[PDB]
Design a protein around this motif. Structure first.
Motif, mmCIF file in Angstrom:
data_model
loop_
_atom_site.group_PDB
_atom_site.id
_atom_site.type_symbol
_atom_site.label_atom_id
_atom_site.label_comp_id
_atom_site.label_asym_id
_atom_site.label_seq_id
_atom_site.Cartn_x
_atom_site.Cartn_y
_atom_site.Cartn_z
ATOM 1 N N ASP A 34 4.993 7.776 -2.788
ATOM 2 C CA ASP A 34 5.513 7.568 -1.327
ATOM 3 C C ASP A 34 6.237 6.140 -1.371
ATOM 4 N N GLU A 42 0.859 -1.750 -0.017
ATOM 5 C CA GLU A 42 0.137 -0.143 -0.056
ATOM 6 C C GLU A 42 0.660 1.387 0.269
ATOM 7 N N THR A 43 0.498 2.308 -0.520
ATOM 8 C CA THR A 43 1.134 3.385 -1.754
ATOM 9 C C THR A 43 0.816 4.587 -1.863
ATOM 10 N N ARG A 44 0.829 5.937 -1.167
ATOM 11 C CA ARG A 44 0.629 7.106 -0.859
ATOM 12 C C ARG A 44 1.228 7.673 -2.046
HETATM 13 C C1 LIG Z 1 3.095 5.227 0.755
HETATM 14 C C2 LIG Z 1 4.434 4.472 1.876
HETATM 15 O O1 LIG Z 1 5.136 3.385 1.710
HETATM 16 N N1 LIG Z 1 4.641 4.760 3.188
HETATM 17 C C3 LIG Z 1 4.219 3.468 3.769
HETATM 18 C C4 LIG Z 1 3.802 4.782 5.358
HETATM 19 C C5 LIG Z 1 3.067 3.549 6.646
HETATM 20 O O2 LIG Z 1 2.533 1.731 5.856
HETATM 21 C C6 LIG Z 1 2.797 5.489 4.994
HETATM 22 C C7 LIG Z 1 1.524 5.186 4.099
HETATM 23 C C8 LIG Z 1 0.339 5.723 3.032
HETATM 24 C C9 LIG Z 1 -0.246 5.331 3.357
HETATM 25 C C10 LIG Z 1 -0.926 4.541 3.035
HETATM 26 C C11 LIG Z 1 0.310 3.434 3.454
HETATM 27 C C12 LIG Z 1 1.448 3.459 3.539
HETATM 28 C C13 LIG Z 1 3.313 6.382 3.493
#
Ligand SMILES: CC(=O)N1C[C@H](CO)[C@H](c2ccccc2)C1
Length: 181
Positions: free
Chosen positions: A79, A54-56
């Motif tokens: 992100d 999961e990646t913003r």
């Molecule tokens: C985008 C990324 O890999 N991040 C890791 C972190 C928390 O696991 C934040 C995030 C933000 C939104 C959803 C998933 C992750 C930013």
């Protein structure tokens, strides 16, 4: 098997991730830093899955030419905690035709797939799924569902990403160096 597949493999093994949106799994090309590309029909939102993480999405821009015509390329800033190898020096500066291209795909459905598609025409205008689109490359290979986002390369150049087909021909959106200044 030969220098075409060698260059394609080198790009796939370091500069691709598997991207998942609500519209499917796509091959996604990383270009430099945390900047990647994907076909605009992937409909990238605020969150995307990158190799099932999961990646913003920090920024997403659907490119259009200065005629305000669709180019079918979305540039995504992720992100992610890691940079891509910078491959911008492999991007062409101008619209062109090419010989002896390879289309390379990496998904759950098609891992480690390489297709010698042959001669690539600067086709230009295409009505792609009902949307007027410019800067289209065409190759005479019967590409299928699951190849969208696939990388098109020649020896030494990364020239486009696969965005569609008509059952007999395949179509890619151009990548140009000027998109990634
Ligand atoms: C985008 C990324 O890999 N991040 C890791 C972190 C928390 O696991 C934040 C995030 C933000 C939104 C959803 C998933 C992750 C930013």
């Amino acid at each position: 098997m030969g220098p075409g597949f060698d260059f394609a493999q080198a790009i796939m093994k370091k500069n691709t991730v598997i991207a998942r949106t609500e519209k499917g799994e796509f091959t996604m090309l990383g270009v430099y830093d945390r900047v990647a590309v994907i076909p605009t029909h992937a409909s990238v939102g605020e969150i995307i899955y990158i190799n099932d993480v999961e990646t913003r999405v920090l920024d997403a821009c659907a490119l259009r030419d200065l005629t305000d015509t669709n180019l079918e390329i979305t540039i995504v800033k992720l992100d992610r905690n890691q940079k891509f190898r910078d491959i911008r020096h492999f991007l062409p500066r101008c619209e062109d035709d090419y010989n002896d291209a390879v289309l390379s795909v990496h998904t759950s459905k098609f891992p480690n797939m390489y297709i010698p598609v042959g001669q690539v025409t600067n086709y230009g205008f295409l009505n792609l799924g009902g949307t007027p689109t410019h800067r289209i490359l065409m190759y005479n290979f019967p590409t299928r569902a699951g190849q969208c986002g696939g990388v098109v390369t020649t020896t030494g150049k990364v020239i486009g990403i696969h965005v569609g087909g008509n059952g007999a021909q395949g179509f890619a959106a151009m990548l140009l160096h000027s998109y990634f200044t």
